[model samples]
Target chain A: SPGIWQLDCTHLEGKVILVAVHVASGYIEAEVIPAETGQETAYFLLKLAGRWPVKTVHTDNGSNFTSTTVKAACWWAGIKQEDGIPYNPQSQGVIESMNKELKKIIGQVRDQAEHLKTAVQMAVFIHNHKRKGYSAGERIVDIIATDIQ
Target chain B: SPGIWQLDCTHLEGKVILVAVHVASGYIEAEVIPAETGQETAYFLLKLAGRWPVKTVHTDNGSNFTSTTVKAACWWAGIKQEDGIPYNPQSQGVIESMNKELKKIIGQVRDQAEHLKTAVQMAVFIHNHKRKGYSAGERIVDIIATDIQ
Candidate 1:
């Protein structure tokens, strides 16, 4: 399951984009959108804590973000934007790591979206609980989160 | 391509979602059709300053975007939408990397709905000059992007 491979793409068409994110620790903020758009970008930003202390809103130079609309949206959000550079991205390392984790979680199930979703949730749960403690070898899966425990 | 990679997700309904992202600069945005819901994410774009910022849009196991959409649409875009994964033991870095480079060019010919070859080429050219440094003779030929349905 650790193997990387090229899967086909034929059925992805009109799905929801859930920008799943972990509240604290600045860990996971995965946005699953129907397609790429500025609206989605803004929508994702809006979903975040509207009044969190101004720290930084990191993102790559995407079309929506570059658009006047996105800029206006960001301005409205009252958060400074820090974008990633081309061919040399840096920020959002946590995001990249989150996705890799999702891939591994989604890997366990073969089909069945519900099962896949559970796998994803459990992975996120497992990942977030890392600060707590995990098991050795196969014990990793056995280690339950606080809520689950 | 700004967003590139080689990953797959064939567990969701037995569908395939191969994603390849260009490491330097890229962000995943969301899109919506009239009725599609969360999860069936597709790739959509809104022009910005006559240039769309997304260098690459990769998928693993969703469908649409990576499989037939890229192949049927761009015959020269140089947007590698699918590839086998890179793991610990396997070693196809050069070949795999070059294949992604090759497949992305398929959009140059056509993208079903649009026939703006020159526009697309120029966009890619500007991207090459700006996104990644290319002196001159680094033209990649024998490129291909597939619709692996």
Candidate 2:
């Protein structure tokens, strides 16, 4: 059980980012949201429906993921959802760390850019791309997705 | 980044057991507490401090870990605390999985005749003790804790 987080809009012009990561695969699903509400997260979850075969999802106790609307959508999607231990961010460490790096880059590079979204997207691209190591896209989908399906 | 869970009195005569696990180490620290309050969880954090070096703790938005008492304690203890994404329990998979096994064992063995605390102790024993492979107390401490310190 892994994958969940809401990235606060530190400087993205009041826009929020939702991040989902596989603890095992380091696979990422990142997006910009209008707000940090459950309704917004619920819509984001709906958008993620087709790309990944989600059977189960893990999240924090945030209402965004737990609100009746989001819960109903998850139920409709046939995805079993559970909440992380209350007061625990490490429960969703993958996305937490991802947010940290993303923000760090954004913070470092935003001053030089017009829109922070560009910085965010570039950070995410680098994250999803590769070094001499692991990547999350289809290239290493088998590796990160081991038994995750 | 792998830690989170809540243990209720479902089996231990209404007592509470707080479990903390390191995802990388398979190392666990569990105890039966007087109540499930922020005060109690703060005390649990203190206990963990002496046993292992704790850098961070992950939890849900549960008041027990989020209340002023818990936050103050975490700050005093110099341990950073973070909340799991709201509504997601799978975000904290390691301890969640451990809770399942713990309850299963307790359910099957709690009625066997010994004091429930004794059973809980033994359950933790069996959990930390040997299987076909690794054990915790010393073995896992060395393994999971190798670089954690």
Candidate 3:
């Protein structure tokens, strides 16, 4: 099995940051959105699935996550969606903690939308490099290479 | 300022898993310890500092963290130690969530000490590779190269 991933949204500079974390790897994927509607969230989910193998997605029972748009996207993608209890941080602790870290990094950048996007990009880049005695990104590259071979 | 880093320990297969997270980058450094002790934690801290610049270290007010041994290590390293409220998960949410993810991965491995160590290594490697469109390990390598230049 690839792994379970948790998805959630946070706000920064009046924009929404859609975030996902692989439960097994602590790897993060995030994007900046003007607003967090069910449509935008669903679109990001599909986009993420295209980049990586998403088996199951876990999220808090927020409207954007629970909406029919997200359900349809998961149905079409053949992904299993697991909903956590609403308003419980522990249930979705992975993404909630990631959101805090993302906000901290994004908060330090210049207060502009494009700057925030760049900040998110850089932040995600650095976050994925979190490893001991090695680089996480390096391992993934190796795996991708192996798969190609 | 570089940034604040959170350090914490969790257990798997009766071994201590020492972990550190760079708040700004979400980069992780971890080691498997035979047991949790102030000396071991301090040793890991110094080992980590040798690799990355650590400005401040936040941890729960656990005895191991608050011990004079660890305090001396921080003092020697010139790292400020900020103790979170005892039993407050939110106070150290970053590392807390990281520990959860680490445990999840480690738990899936064969129940043995060396296997657990390898699992931690792989888990950290994979975690650091988490990004939206690029590789975090690649960015860090580039930064390292730039600094050398």
Candidate 4:
């Protein structure tokens, strides 16, 4: 709905990576994908399996979600697919914000021996840690832990 | 995980309007409220009731979704809440696409006696009709009917 767009993986040495965030927990999931194709999108989900409970996902008109490939993957996960309103960046501010935060860290770690994958993983780790007063990552852990309680 | 974004309503002709769309169905639901409060957002959900199956919804980090007002409504509807990836318009292309189509119709009827609300309804009706080979509106009707059959 506002400005600011893209994954900004310029620091990845041109490698393409996909990042997924938990809406409530600020917990993140990231993967280095070969392409943004539906197959790659589905692959990302496979990587996310058992990490958290993913009930639904949102995507753009990108072929990843519309294509038969990703559609089947979502069904396998019981994840509903939702798309944001077209052209409104405000609609997708959450994950985009996460990406922005990630790029900032990736930029800081540039020239380090850490590979892009490791750097992203470290960023996600720090992101999931409690910050200031809100600990989305911790809250999610609590919720999942007490699901039966 | 998939492409779904939040609903952002901008000012149209100095009026407030809220619009929502389902990613898979291309179906739409909308409302015009006095203010963009959590209560108003909750009110919009009521308008969508019975029109289509709203499994989950995405909203911006705006206070509307975080408020207790809208939370209760979502719980009542069994719709899970997810936030959009921040600042990514492409993520919400489906609903944005719908908004573009609506504005086109609104432009056509602007000079006539049709009010914005009536024009929007008419636009939705026309959108629900067959185009190319698929009719989103028709397909939704069939899905609902089969739900009982």
Q: What DockQ do you compute for every candidate structure? A: 0.01, 0.01, 0.02, 0.01
Per-residue lDDT value at A96 in model 4: 65
Candidate 2 is graded, for docking, as incorrect
What are the RMSD figures for all models against the true structure? 22.3, 21.7, 19.6, 21.7
List iRMS (one decimal) for every candidate. 20.6, 21.2, 14.1, 19.8
TM-score of each candidate structure, all chains considered together:
0.33, 0.42, 0.44, 0.43
Q: Please tell me what DockQ candidate 2 reaches.
A: 0.01
The digit string of per-residue lDDT tens for model 4 on A23-88 reads: 555556566655567766664553343223456666544565577866765665456666534466
Residue A81 displacement in candidate 2 (angstroms): 48
Compute the lDDT of residue A30 as modeled in candidate 3.
74
**Across residues B1-149, which tens digit of lDDT does each residue of candidate 3 receive?**
24467777788777887878665556576778898888777766654543444668876447855699788767755678887553665655656677887777666643522456656754665566667454434344343333323
lDDT of each: 0.33, 0.54, 0.63, 0.55
Task: Return model 3's CA RMSD, one decimal.
Answer: 19.6
Worst 10 residues of 2 chain B by lDDT: B2-11
Compare candidates 1 and 4 on lDDT and give the better one.
4
Candidate 3 docking quality: incorrect, acceptable, medium or high: incorrect
- TM-score-wise, the better of 2 and 3 is 3
Tens digits of per-residue lDDT for model 2, A77-104: 5567666553565645644556787787
* lDDT per residue as tens, model 2, B67-147: 887786567555777765535656456455667888877677576424555456445555655453544534433432233
Of candidate 3 chain B, the 10-residue stretch with the lowest lDDT total is: B140-149
Q: Candidate order by lDDT, highest to lowest?
A: 3, 4, 2, 1
lDDT of 1 by residue, A1-149 (tens): 11111101111224433333322332233334556566556545543322112235545445544766556545655555555443444435554655555566546532423433333433433444345332121122121111122
| lDDT at position B18, candidate 1 | 24
**Candidate 1, residues B29-133: lDDT per residue as tens digits?**
112233321233322211110011233433433444444533432222334344334354343454355334423542442342132322223223323323243
